[PDB]
Design a protein around this ligand. Structure first.
Ligand SMILES: OC[C@@]1(O)OC[C@@H](O)[C@@H](O)[C@@H]1O
Ligand SMILES: OC[C@@]1(O)OC[C@@H](O)[C@@H](O)[C@@H]1O
Ligand SMILES: OC[C@@]1(O)OC[C@@H](O)[C@@H](O)[C@@H]1O
Ligand SMILES: [Cl-]
Ligand SMILES: [Cl-]
Ligand SMILES: [Cl-]
Ligand SMILES: [Cl-]
Ligand SMILES: [Cl-]
Ligand SMILES: [Cl-]
Ligand SMILES: [Cl-]
Ligand SMILES: [Cl-]
Lengths: 209, 206, 205, 210
């Protein structure tokens, strides 16, 4: 079974609620997207492996803990992904950024990957994939294909809202990934959008239509 | 009945705290890590906030969301070092009311105070980088209780057992959140291993 | 008319640009200076924005203030390096519409999401470097065809070959750069330049 | 020589200052705009910094870059309002030493009451950027500058959002060698010494007190 973690922290639910206002501004919506993305990053990095090391402290040698392994890689799915990347980099600013571009065909609801440039030695790195919505799951399944195809074994997915249909498709497609969502909504409408959902999060964050 | 202590053992909090122990660390990075670790302690101290269902107009019609109940939280930075963690705390609670407090170590007496209104109806997050003997923290809490506050949480980067014991005996209803419980104090009252003169390292004043 | 060029010689811009030239600079530092310099160029390029007076209620009664006239400007980041300066430009113009463009080359864009009514908006095309000006010219062609008639280019460094190409193809755009380097090497990189800005900002190799 | 005064007319500075004047503005956005307008005033005030050519190893060999000459600048925020602008100043000079100076105005006499000061060392070899949102009578700024000169500081720049003519005249008479950078020069002071149109009580708005 796929590891699913619905973050129920009061601040996460409060800020997610503000983003559901249909009259919210693009500015406010962008700040909240990055803010909630920052909190989901703290929930997803709670199981990182640490190692004890001795360093010269203010009053002589002292034992400190550092994150074991090579630097993490943040995988923002263009375009909506960038609206959450700043919140992630806040806790891991040395993270390697692997930009992946994917837009959805509103006619077929299938993913259309147009860009990718992953970091090197990704097989020795953990990937934090950030995308505000998990509706049918096509875009996330297409992203994980590129990562595993590149040799990445450790993958974590951070999303604001996720529909059961998208969680089911992702689980049968890649059950070894861990999903961290700020909410599990009811489902999808006849146009493939999540309900209650956040609407067209992508165009709402970039200010397009 | 006993004072609740929460030593945040999250991998990023332990890693960022360890970097602040570097003797060659710069004021720039020490000040940044102080805020970063401060925002993570605030997320831990706000996990028990009470929420309430409310209906608002969503992107697809009416939707029931949750909102934090009660008046806005008050951040209480202790001059001067406390101002160095204020940015990190206001990061997840930007509407928080800031109540600056200055304690003079003589028993200690406050020399400056500008508390928010109706503090008896708010939760107070007292922030200070270190809890050594607990003199300044205990004095700051005495002042908050006289004002009528009954819900208090203390956020500190490092804390010594002496300070923890002093705070527990003086205010057991307080809840302490620290990135580390150090070994003790030296003959000058500094925390060991500690972070040295945190205030001077944050502002860059010898 | 000759293309309007503005080389930002502000002490902080030249100081931060100098820090980015270090060969041992970290992705974190380089990425942070890219946005920092990006925000300063944005401020330098928005000094001519027209304003209109409006009456609001001040603390001591009504007061006449000024707001930015016309529709919100659009930031056009070129994939992929261009995204490394986007947060810097949004800092002082957080309401700006983001028009992502992907050029491959007439110029054939592989991906585009332009804002609506772009013919009634100013466009801040951002990209860390202007080596030959191929990508920048291709992007401006797409914006001009969409109806935009007010375009400004923001780059950290630019080679004389790129400035000349851009000036010939689009003399009505206005260029803002933190520096005008000597030229290009046998591989097209700007010299002294910043090297592979895209890889340094994201951490790829 | 008269005091060098600079009123920043940049459209974004005028627009952002105009938003801070709305009476129903929240504490959150008032604090954000105070810091942002503070970073734009920092850029304007650091346009005359002296630089020196230095050779460093670039990615494609040696290259001559420019660097700011002298020791690190000291930011001087006047508590409490001052902290609301300090973040915008540090954005451009993050290595700057912070010299905290605490002063509250005696609303009965309008005279400043200094209660705290912690100046950086070797301040006689540094430039000081004093930040405070309002320059009403100028008492707080004049008192702060007296502390800096007493410590041996010679180069001082003042960064304020709104300034009243009374405060500008009081500051020029007491310390004409300082440079004043303000986002606006208002009409004057009311009967209670507050700036009009001004920003009201900037200290309480930024901290959300009273
Ligand atoms: O499961 C969601 C969760 O991890 O979110 C953060 C905290 O509220 C936790 O108590 C809670 O269990
Ligand atoms: O990182 C996870 C965790 O330990 O820290 C955040 C809080 O919400 C806790 O409840 C949670 O268990
Ligand atoms: O104005 C009242 C005041 O001066 O009273 C004494 C101290 O508590 C000060 O902080 C406070 O401002
Ligand atoms: Cl170990
Ligand atoms: Cl070891
Ligand atoms: Cl290792
Ligand atoms: Cl929910
Ligand atoms: Cl009260
Ligand atoms: Cl520890
Ligand atoms: Cl159109
Ligand atoms: Cl060198």
């Amino acid at each position: 079974a796929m590891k699913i973690v619905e973050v129920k922290h009061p601040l996460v639910k409060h800020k997610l609620g503000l983003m559901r206002e249909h009259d919210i501004s693009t500015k406010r919506f962008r700040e909240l997207a990055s803010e909630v993305g920052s909190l989901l990053t703290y929930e997803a990095t709670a199981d990182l492996e640490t190692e004890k090391v001795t360093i010269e402290g203010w009053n002589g040698p002292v034992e400190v803990e550092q994150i074991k392994g090579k630097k993490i890689t943040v995988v923002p799915i263009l375009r909506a992904g960038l609206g959450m990347m700043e919140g992630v980099l806040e806790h891991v600013p040395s993270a390697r950024i692997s930009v992946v571009g994917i837009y959805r065909n509103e006619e077929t609801l299938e993913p259309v990957p147009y860009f990718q440039k992953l970091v090197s030695n990704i097989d020795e790195r953990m990937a934090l994939v950030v995308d505000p919505m998990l509706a049918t799951g096509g875009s996330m399944i297409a992203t994980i294909d590129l990562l595993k195809n590149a040799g990445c074994t450790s993958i974590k997915v951070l999303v604001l809202v996720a529909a059961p249909e998208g969680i089911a498709a992702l689980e049968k497609a890649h059950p070894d990934v861990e999903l961290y969502t700020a909410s599990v909504d009811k489902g999808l409408n006849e146009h493939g959008y999540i309900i209650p959902g956040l609407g067209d999060a992508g165009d709402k964050i970039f200010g397009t239509k």
